[PDB]
Amino acid sequence: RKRRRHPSG
Amino acid sequence: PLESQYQVGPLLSVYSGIRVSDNLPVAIKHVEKDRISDWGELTRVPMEVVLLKKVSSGFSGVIRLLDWFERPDSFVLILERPEPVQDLFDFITERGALQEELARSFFWQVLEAVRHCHNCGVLHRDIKDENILIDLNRGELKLIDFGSGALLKDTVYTDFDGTRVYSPPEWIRYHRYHGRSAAVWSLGILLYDMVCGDIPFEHDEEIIGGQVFFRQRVSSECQHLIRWCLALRPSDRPTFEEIQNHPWMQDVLLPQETAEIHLH
Ligand SMILES: O=C(O)c1ccc(Cc2coc3cc(O)ccc23)cc1
Numbered sequence A: 001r002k003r004r005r006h007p008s009g
Numbered sequence B: 001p002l003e004s005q006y007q008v009g010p011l012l013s014v015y016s017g018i019r020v021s022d023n024l025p026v027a028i029k030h031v032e033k034d035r036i037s038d039w040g041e042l043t044r045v046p047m048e049v050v051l052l053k054k055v056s057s058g059f060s061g062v063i064r065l066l067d068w069f070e071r072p073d074s075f076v077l078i079l080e081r082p083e084p085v086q087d088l089f090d091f092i093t094e095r096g097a098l099q100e101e102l103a104r105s106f107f108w109q110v111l112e113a114v115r116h117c118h119n120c121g122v123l124h125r126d127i128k129d130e131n132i133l134i135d136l137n138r139g140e141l142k143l144i145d146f147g148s149g150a151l152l153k154d155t156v157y158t159d160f161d162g163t164r165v166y167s168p169p170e171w172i173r174y175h176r177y178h179g180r181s182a183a184v185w186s187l188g189i190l191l192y193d194m195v196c197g198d199i200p201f202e203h204d205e206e207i208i209g210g211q212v213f214f215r216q217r218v219s220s221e222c223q224h225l226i227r228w229c230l231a232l233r234p235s236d237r238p239t240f241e242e243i244q245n246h247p248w249m250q251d252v253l254l255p256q257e258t259a260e261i262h263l264h
Helices: B047-055 B089-097 B100-119 B169-174 B177-197 B204-209 B220-229 B240-242 B253-264
Strands: B006-011 B014-019 B024-032 B039-041 B044-046 B064-069 B072-082 B085-087 B132-135 B138-142
Touching: B006 B024, B014 B047, B039 B047, B044 B047, B047 B064, B047 B072, B072 B085, B085 B089, B089 B132, B100 B132, B100 B138, B100 B177, B100 B253, B169 B177, B169 B204, B177 B220, B177 B240, B220 B240
Parallel strands: none
Antiparallel strands: B006 B014, B014 B024, B024 B072, B039 B044, B064 B072, B085 B132, B132 B138
């Protein structure tokens, strides 16, 4: 399962 | 002058740096004026500088703003840099789902840091594992990146620029939220992330759906706290006091115990 960051901004 | 007081290093727009006055490790964060959402006064400065000053003190749970400079097209923020560090996102990626004892210690430290923010009149609005640094030798956590924050108020918020997968369902559905209850939701996402190895929701339908599936073995006590923080109705969520009085949150490790047991 692909764990990834999530940009905010 | 900025270039004289610090030795600027390579990238980490944040750069490694050393304060020439005493060889102190610093992080040098550059923020372009054209991309700045909200401004405040202290002297017109980015809201991020206002919030960082209000939380700067002896409490080691939030990142300390050491200095700042204004340039024609940008502001430069001199932040403290602990060493050695890893952010909580990379920590969870490498180690997977954390033991509940470790998650308890980490989560408790985040709660104390967020309470510090609120006590200083500051709402972070972007609590997530990416925005948490782990002092690997002292076992102390630091909340970073106030770039999405606002002054804490008790009235409704209608703007938001934090991380959507940590944002609450009242923001998804109605584009409105209150500060503390939205914060508790993001802490529910963070706690699940700690004990399961990744966040529970990726899509808006999951955020508003109201069902939490546990992909890892998690104690009934911890599951209950997570589900309470992730209540769909904001008023059904626990206060910070109820979180820290919850049965799962008892007998927390000290930061140095946490480092000796889990980090060294
Ligand atoms: O925006 C802020 O407030 C902020 C940004 C950066 C740091 C310094 C830092 C040192 O090592 C790191 C490793 C990381 O994975 C992430 C950040 C850092 C501190 C604060």
